A and B are shown apart, each in its own frame.
Chain A
Amino acid sequence: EFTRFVPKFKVLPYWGNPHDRKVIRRFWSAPFHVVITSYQL
Chain B
Amino acid sequence: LTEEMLLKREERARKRRLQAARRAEEHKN
Contacts and interface: CB of A to CB of B under 8 A. Distances in A.
A5 B19 CA distance: 30
Interface size class of B (residues with CB under 8 A): under 10
B20 A26 contact: yes
Nearest to A16: B27
A37 to B, nearest CB: 15
A27 B28 contact: no
Contacts of B24: 23-24, 27
Contacts of A23: 20, 23-24, 27
B27 to A, nearest CB: 6
Contacts of B23: 23
A26 B24 CA distance: 11
